[PDB]
Amino acid sequence: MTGAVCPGSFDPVTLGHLDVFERAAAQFDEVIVAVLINPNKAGMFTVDERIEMIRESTADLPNLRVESGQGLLVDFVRERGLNAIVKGLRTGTDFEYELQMAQMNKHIAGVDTFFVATAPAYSFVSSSLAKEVATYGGDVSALLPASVHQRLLGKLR
Amino acid sequence: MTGAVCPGSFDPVTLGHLDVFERAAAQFDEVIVAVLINPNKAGMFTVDERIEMIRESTADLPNLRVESGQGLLVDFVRERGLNAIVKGLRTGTDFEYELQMAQMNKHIAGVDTFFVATAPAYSFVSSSLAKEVATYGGDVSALLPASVHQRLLGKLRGQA
Amino acid sequence: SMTGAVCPGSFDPVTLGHLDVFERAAAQFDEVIVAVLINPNKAGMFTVDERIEMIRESTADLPNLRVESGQGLLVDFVRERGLNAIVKGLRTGTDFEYELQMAQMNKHIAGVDTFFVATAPAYSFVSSSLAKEVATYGGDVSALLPASVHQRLLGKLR
Amino acid sequence: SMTGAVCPGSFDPVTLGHLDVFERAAAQFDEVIVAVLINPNKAGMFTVDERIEMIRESTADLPNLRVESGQGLLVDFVRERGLNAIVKGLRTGTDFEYELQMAQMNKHIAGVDTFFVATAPAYSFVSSSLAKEVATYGGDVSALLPASVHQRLLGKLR
Amino acid sequence: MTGAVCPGSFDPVTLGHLDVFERAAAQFDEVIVAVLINPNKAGMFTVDERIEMIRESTADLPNLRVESGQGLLVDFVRERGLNAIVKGLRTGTDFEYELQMAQMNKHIAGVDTFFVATAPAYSFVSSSLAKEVATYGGDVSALLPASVHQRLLGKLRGQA
Amino acid sequence: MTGAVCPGSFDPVTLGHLDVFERAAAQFDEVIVAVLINPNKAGMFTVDERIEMIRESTADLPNLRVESGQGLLVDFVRERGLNAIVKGLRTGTDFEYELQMAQMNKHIAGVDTFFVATAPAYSFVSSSLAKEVATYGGDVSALLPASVHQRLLGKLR
Ligand SMILES: CC(C)(COP(=O)(O)OP(=O)(O)OC[C@H]1O[C@@H](n2cnc3c(N)ncnc32)[C@H](O)[C@@H]1O)[C@@H](O)C(=O)NCCC(=O)NCCS
Ligand SMILES: CC(C)(COP(=O)(O)OP(=O)(O)OC[C@H]1O[C@@H](n2cnc3c(N)ncnc32)[C@H](O)[C@@H]1O)[C@@H](O)C(=O)NCCC(=O)NCCS
Ligand SMILES: CC(C)(COP(=O)(O)OP(=O)(O)OC[C@H]1O[C@@H](n2cnc3c(N)ncnc32)[C@H](O)[C@@H]1O)[C@@H](O)C(=O)NCCC(=O)NCCS
Ligand SMILES: CC(C)(COP(=O)(O)OP(=O)(O)OC[C@H]1O[C@@H](n2cnc3c(N)ncnc32)[C@H](O)[C@@H]1O)[C@@H](O)C(=O)NCCC(=O)NCCS
Ligand SMILES: CC(C)(COP(=O)(O)OP(=O)(O)OC[C@H]1O[C@@H](n2cnc3c(N)ncnc32)[C@H](O)[C@@H]1O)[C@@H](O)C(=O)NCCC(=O)NCCS
Ligand SMILES: CC(C)(COP(=O)(O)OP(=O)(O)OC[C@H]1O[C@@H](n2cnc3c(N)ncnc32)[C@H](O)[C@@H]1O)[C@@H](O)C(=O)NCCC(=O)NCCS
Numbered sequence: 001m002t003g004a005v006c007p008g009s010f011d012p013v014t015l016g017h018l019d020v021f022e023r024a025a026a027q028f029d030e031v032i033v034a035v036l037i038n039p040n041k042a043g044m045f046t047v048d049e050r051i052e053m054i055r056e057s058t059a060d061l062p063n064l065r066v067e068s069g070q071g072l073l074v075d076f077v078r079e080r081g082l083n084a085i086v087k088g089l090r091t092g093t094d095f096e097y098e099l100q101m102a103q104m105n106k107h108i109a110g111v112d113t114f115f116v117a118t119a120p121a122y123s124f125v126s127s128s129l130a131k132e133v134a135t136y137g138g139d140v141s142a143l144l145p146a147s148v149h150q151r152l153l154g155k156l157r
Numbered sequence: 158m159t160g161a162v163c164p165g166s167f168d169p170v171t172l173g174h175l176d177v178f179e180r181a182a183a184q185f186d187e188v189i190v191a192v193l194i195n196p197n198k199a200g201m202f203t204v205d206e207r208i209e210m211i212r213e214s215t216a217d218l219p220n221l222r223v224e225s226g227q228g229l230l231v232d233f234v235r236e237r238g239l240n241a242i243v244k245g246l247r248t249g250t251d252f253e254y255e256l257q258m259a260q261m262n263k264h265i266a267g268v269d270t271f272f273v274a275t276a277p278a279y280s281f282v283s284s285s286l287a288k289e290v291a292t293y294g295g296d297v298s299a300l301l302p303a304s305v306h307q308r309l310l311g312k313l314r315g316q317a
Numbered sequence: 318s319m320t321g322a323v324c325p326g327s328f329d330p331v332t333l334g335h336l337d338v339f340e341r342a343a344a345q346f347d348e349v350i351v352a353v354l355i356n357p358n359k360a361g362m363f364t365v366d367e368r369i370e371m372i373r374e375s376t377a378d379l380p381n382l383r384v385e386s387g388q389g390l391l392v393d394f395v396r397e398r399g400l401n402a403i404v405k406g407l408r409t410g411t412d413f414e415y416e417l418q419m420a421q422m423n424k425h426i427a428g429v430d431t432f433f434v435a436t437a438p439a440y441s442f443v444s445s446s447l448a449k450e451v452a453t454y455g456g457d458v459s460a461l462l463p464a465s466v467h468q469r470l471l472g473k474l475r
Numbered sequence: 476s477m478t479g480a481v482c483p484g485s486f487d488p489v490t491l492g493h494l495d496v497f498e499r500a501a502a503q504f505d506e507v508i509v510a511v512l513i514n515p516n517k518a519g520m521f522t523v524d525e526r527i528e529m530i531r532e533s534t535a536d537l538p539n540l541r542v543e544s545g546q547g548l549l550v551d552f553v554r555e556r557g558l559n560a561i562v563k564g565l566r567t568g569t570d571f572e573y574e575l576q577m578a579q580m581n582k583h584i585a586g587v588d589t590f591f592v593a594t595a596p597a598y599s600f601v602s603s604s605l606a607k608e609v610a611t612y613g614g615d616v617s618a619l620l621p622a623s624v625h626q627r628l629l630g631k632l633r
Numbered sequence: 634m635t636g637a638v639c640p641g642s643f644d645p646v647t648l649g650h651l652d653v654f655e656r657a658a659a660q661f662d663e664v665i666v667a668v669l670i671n672p673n674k675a676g677m678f679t680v681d682e683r684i685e686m687i688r689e690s691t692a693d694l695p696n697l698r699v700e701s702g703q704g705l706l707v708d709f710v711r712e713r714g715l716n717a718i719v720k721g722l723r724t725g726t727d728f729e730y731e732l733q734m735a736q737m738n739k740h741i742a743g744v745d746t747f748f749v750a751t752a753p754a755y756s757f758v759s760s761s762l763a764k765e766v767a768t769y770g771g772d773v774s775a776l777l778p779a780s781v782h783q784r785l786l787g788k789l790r791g792q793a
Numbered sequence: 794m795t796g797a798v799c800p801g802s803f804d805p806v807t808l809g810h811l812d813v814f815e816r817a818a819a820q821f822d823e824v825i826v827a828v829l830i831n832p833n834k835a836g837m838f839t840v841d842e843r844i845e846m847i848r849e850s851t852a853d854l855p856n857l858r859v860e861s862g863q864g865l866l867v868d869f870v871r872e873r874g875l876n877a878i879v880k881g882l883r884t885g886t887d888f889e890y891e892l893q894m895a896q897m898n899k900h901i902a903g904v905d906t907f908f909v910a911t912a913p914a915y916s917f918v919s920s921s922l923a924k925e926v927a928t929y930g931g932d933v934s935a936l937l938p939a940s941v942h943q944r945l946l947g948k949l950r
Binding site: 599615 | 741
């Protein structure tokens with residue numbers, strides 16, 4: 001049985017993230033989406049809220065489940081008997097950031113990382129920029145799953 | 158069950174490539190290394206020579222095999238009943254180049270591409286630069302599989 | 318008064334990515350001239366007259382655009398027509414560096430300025446070179462090119 | 476008819492690099508509006524009114540430019556004024572990626588287009604943040620800022 | 634005769650930094666490592682702690698010494714009668730960041746900057762990521778000098 | 794005695810190259826400019842012509858001399874009892890290219906490389922683009938030393 005973890009902040013999950021999940025789920029026997037706090041935010045949504053938004057958006061991926069993670073990512077991965085991380089890349093900035101972490105994670109624990117390329121339609125999509133646009137009344141409905149849009153309006157209103 | 162294709166010129170295969178193969182083979186049930194011609198490159202070794210060197214260098218990888226293809230990469234992949242490509246990345250230029258092909262390949266055939274980061278030790282290794290260094294007598298023995306190194310140096314001494 | 322810009326390139330052949338740039342230029346400048354020029358570091362497929370023809374077919378619905386060719390410096394092409402602006406599109410970091418260098422050189426030697434626009438997300442991976450390669454090996458690039466160009470591309474290949 | 480573009484930014488403070496962009500925008504658009512906006516991910520030094528004042532002092536010789544502020548989405552600022560174009564400057568690959576993302580987002584949510592221009596080579600290393608840092612520790616940034624701004628910068632620091 | 638300054642936050646010094654120091658010291662008659670505060674970073678160790686760790690880690694470098702500075706880097710450099718800065722580069726982002734400062738520093742004071750490429754083995758090493766990994770119990774012992782590693786882990790266990 | 798080699802095609806030398814030479818000569822006791830053929834050109838100028846253009850443009854750098862090089866760069870460097878290469882960087886493209894060669898050269902021979910940043914004024918300057926602009930009558934006189942401009946016109950006319 002093959003398996004991978006898809007870690008992130010997912011604050012909130014976007015259609016770009018979902019595209020990664022779908023492609024990971026198509027190639028691995030099990031996918032665990034791990035919701036972690038990134039060391040330099042506090043977030044708009046609680047971990048539990050993030051988890052629910054992901055679960056509601058991934059119901060059609062039967063081999064995917066969602067979990068909170070704390071502490072070191074490579075510990076999370078190894079504790080669940082896996083040895084693969086799946087991340088996504090939009091930009092050269094993503095590439096540099098992710099390459100550093102991938103090499104570090106492999107060095108400290110032997111855990112490998114696979115990257116998927118963004119869909120062209122979602123290349124400019126990030127949680128941070130979506131939240132900013134929405135905060136000032138901009139329409140980001142085409143960039144997010146339905147399970148996020150209402151929650152996002154609620155948190156802003 | 159799960160499977161991936163690792164395509165490339167592999168002209169010749171380096172320890173950088175082999176590292177990618179090993180990591181792909183450790184995650185997927187079967188891996189097929191696909192030796193293809195890059196339309197935009199001059200080559201040194203024939204496809205058959207490239208296949209020989211990879212087969213020679215991948216003996217410890219039981220679930221991997223090596224084949225060639227004459228057309229579109231996505232046709233090679235789908236004809237073997239697979240839908241995943243695995244490619245390695247060293248540099249930002251690799252990233253842009255590979256992102257473009259990944260999106261093109263997904264657009265025309267629905268085939269997905271997964272990237273892996275180079276091993277830090279092999280980040281500066283390419284077939285082109287290894288060939289160039291060896292052409293002028295530099296020591297690339299730590300960058301290539303043993304059999305590749307012998308065949309490369311022999312080839313160069315024949316001056317072809 | 319009326320403003321104007323030149324959209325130069327190899328356009329070998331013109332793609333939906335190029336066309337997106339032309340449309341956006343024509344929306345913001347009173348006058349746009351698409352300039353077909355030879356890149357001295359490229360081996361071309363179509364002739365200049367073929368390239369011009371394909372662009373003209375594909376830009377019928379842009380009333381303030383015309384298509385021309387030139388055989389020397391881009392900046393001479395621009396100034397000869399009483400203009401001082403170039404518009405280019407960017408997909409990648411590599412495009413950015415390449416275009417930045419030319420933009421600064423062109424400003425230095427002639428005082429002509431250059432404006433860049435970002436690719437449409439849907440056309441980020443589209444290039445003339447790759448569409449030609451994919452088409453050569455039977456791949457379907459119909460969603461990446463004008464039907465006009467798709468036909469002329471498939472025509473010569475097959 | 477007349478064309479128009481908005482040149483938005485933090486401008487905290489405006490530098491010779493920004494001014495170069497304004498001049499080039501004003502040369503190619505009939506109307507330019509410099510928009511002082513808050514970046515929600517930045518801690519600002521000068522007030523909006525101070526920023527506006529420094530830009531106005533520095534752009535006296537550009538007759539077709541005015542300076543305004545906004546408190547919401549850039550694309551609302553642009554459309555409210557009957558415009559559909561943004562002009563931004565690029566120094567680095569990091570600028571390119573950042574601006575590309577915003578340009579595609581802004582086009583997506585409002586249909587507003589963005590044009591980029593390359594930095595003047597002499598101002599490639601100039602940023603508001605670094606000029607402020609260098610000035611704070613006594614360094615001479617006089618060749619990087621308008622004398623107006625240099626004075627107001629040195630003023631608050633000393 | 635010839636000399637260069639190697640400036641940085643060095644919070645804490647890593648084997649990546651030390652590699653730069655060694656290569657600078659092998660080319661210039663004297664090297665001064667300058668521990669400076671980066672105005673745009675939160676720090677973990679005091680400047681004095683940083684100096685101690687570097688001094689501890691550079692014993693095999695006879696022509697190198699370590700000092701601190703409170704103002705402009707270019708003032709630190711020129712006050713010691715030097716005119717060269719040496720910095721290392723791992724990534725394209727390092728390059729853009731360092732190019733900007735190099736041009737600024739040459740503009741305001743005429744001081745030159747020389748860059749060196751990271752050792753491939755340490756390309757992914759940064760103080761920030763090493764601190765983060767150690768904060769969560771990961772093994773960064775191969776990335777840091779022995780004394781640094783002890784002081785870092787001790788510091789973290791005190792949870793400061 | 795410290796020393797470095799400044800290798801390149803220099804076809805022709807530009808004011809950007811000269812800026813590198815000047816900064817190298819200010820920090821090293823001796824600088825050797827090495828004119829090599831880059832494996833993928835044939836060049837506009839002969840090696841001897843390139844050498845003369847450099848010598849004429851560097852007369853004011855008394856600790857700099859100019860030489861042709863053949864074969865492996867790190868052999869050239871070590872044969873002259875040096876262990877340092879000095880290159881220049883304009884762009885991210887330069888950085889990637891040069892970083893690869895610097896790591897390769899250090900790996901195969903232990904020779905180190907130091908890079909200098911371009912002067913802002915010359916960042917867009919390359920031999921290739923200068924030659925192209927000149928070929929179509931463009932004025933590149935502000936980008937090249939005087940010892941190059943006449944030779945360049947002569948080679949084009
Ligand atoms: C939580 C981690 C993974 C950081 O996550 P991050 O905040 O970056 O996640 P974020 O939600 O922003 O993004 C998640 C992933 O989705 C990708 N992505 C986002 N949008 C898109 C898109 N449109 N298309 C494709 N991919 C996308 C991102 O590039 C990223 O890879 C990291 O902080 C971590 O591992 N923390 C645990 C502690 C640890 O182990 N530290 C050591 C690291 S070496
Ligand atoms: C043959 C193809 C894949 C090009 O291969 P390419 O020449 O780039 O392969 P090359 O041998 O150079 O490299 C192979 C792969 O190994 C990676 N790699 C190289 N060195 C290393 C290293 N040290 N570490 C990790 N990865 C590495 C490369 O980044 C690349 O991903 C391409 O031309 C192709 O697909 N041709 C078929 C026609 C086709 O389908 N065309 C349409 C493409 S959209
Ligand atoms: C012909 C010139 C402009 C080069 O053109 P080039 O070959 O690069 O054109 P090409 O057709 O490939 O692309 C044209 C433009 O479209 C852009 N583009 C391509 N695809 C896309 C897309 N999908 N989306 C947006 N933009 C795109 C390109 O980035 C480029 O800006 C250049 O060679 C030139 O100016 N030649 C004349 C001689 C001269 O003046 N030389 C001195 C130059 S400083
Ligand atoms: C205010 C905005 C535009 C950000 O501006 P920013 O802080 O980046 O401005 P800053 O003053 O730093 O720079 C302004 C512009 O000048 C350019 N520039 C700076 N220096 C130079 C130079 N030397 N040469 C050329 N250009 C330069 C910058 O690259 C940038 O394009 C952005 O935060 C915004 O739009 N805010 C409004 C809210 C909104 O709409 N959010 C959604 C965005 S998708
Ligand atoms: C302190 C300065 C230099 C910033 O240092 P910084 O925080 O970036 O240092 P840091 O420790 O992070 O890194 C130091 C150097 O080591 C390099 N480096 C890091 N890791 C590695 C590695 N593995 N290999 C090679 N090099 C490396 C970095 O790229 C950097 O060049 C800067 O803030 C400064 O000059 N401050 C003084 C005030 C001043 O003069 N300001 C004006 C500057 S224009
Ligand atoms: C000859 C070499 C160095 C390549 O030289 P190249 O053709 O790149 O030189 P070129 O003349 O183009 O440039 C010379 C240097 O000047 C720099 N430069 C150019 N313009 C500028 C500028 N305006 N500002 C700063 N630096 C500049 C370049 O970035 C480059 O570093 C290389 O091919 C080589 O080493 N060949 C020998 C064989 C060998 O050893 N091969 C193995 C290499 S690992």
